[PDB]
Amino acid sequence: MQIFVKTLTGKTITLEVEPSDTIENVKAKIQDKEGIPPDQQRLIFAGKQLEDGRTLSDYNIQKESTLHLVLR
Amino acid sequence: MQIFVKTLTGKTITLEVEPSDTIENVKAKIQDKEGIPPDQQRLIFAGKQLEDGRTLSDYNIQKESTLHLVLR
């Protein structure tokens, strides 16, 4: 399924993922596309910070869901 | 003395500093805690941008003062 990630600068990125994909895997996909190291990235969905040891399905993230990316 | 630094994402960081500490030293402390390189950080206090060659006392920053961090 496709998901969207918005940046602090107003950019939107589209990613192809599976509900069984891990958050760490998602961060890795972002690194590949934007060059941002996973340790400097924070992912938020519906006001909650997503953990690297959990999956998309655990957060009930559905197709065309939009995640927010924060930089540290 | 303790000071506070707020981020663009709404996070607040507490740092231990001395009035004789330099702004560059303060940035270095932030790098250690957040991983943000000093060249990408801008510190603002009471509407003024702080320079790397000046100290906290020069800006009359007192205990429990709150600084604002900007990213470039």
Residue A9 falls in which region: left (phi positive, over 0), alpha (psi -120 to 50) or beta:
alpha
How far does A37 lie from chain B, in Å, by closest CA? 11
Q: What's the first-to-final CA gap in chain B, in angstroms?
A: 28
What are A49's strand-pairing partners?
Answer: A44
Range(s) of the domain holding residue A7: 1-72
Which three-class secondary structure state does DSSP give residue B15? strand
How far does A48 lie from chain B, in Å, by closest CA? 14
Count Cβ atoms below 10 Å from residue A7 Cβ, excluding itself.
Answer: 15
- Give B36's contacts (C-beta < 8 A, 6+ positions apart): A72, B30, B71
Interface of B with A in 16-55 (CB under 8 A): 34-36
| Alpha-carbon distance values, A56 to A38, A72, B11, B60 (Å) | 16, 22, 25, 48
The CATH number of the domain where B66 resides is what? 3.10.20.90
Long-range CB pairs of A38-45 (<8 Å, 24+ gap) are: A39/B35, A40/A71, A40/A72, A40/B35, A41/A69, A41/A70, A41/A71, A41/A72, A42/A69, A42/A70, A42/A71, A42/A72, A42/B9, A43/A5, A43/A67, A43/A68, A43/A69, A43/A70, A44/A68, A44/A69, A44/A70
Task: Count up the domains in chain A and report the number.
Answer: 1
Q: Of all helices (H) and strands (E), which one includes residue B29?
A: helix B23-34
Closest A-chain CA to B70: A72
How far does B7 lie from chain A, in Å, by closest CA? 9
Nearest to A56 by CA among A13, A9, A12, A22: A22
| CB contacts, 8 Å: B34 with chain A | 72
Distance CA A17, CA B57 (A): 52
DSSP H helical ranges for chain A? 23-34
Distance CA B32, CA B38 (A): 10
CB contact under 8 A, A72 and B8: no
Nearest to B3 by CA among B38, B27, B36: B27
Q: Of all helices (H) and strands (E), which one includes residue B66?
A: strand B66-71
Q: Of all helices (H) and strands (E), which one includes residue B43?
A: strand B41-45
Closest A-chain CA to B30: A72
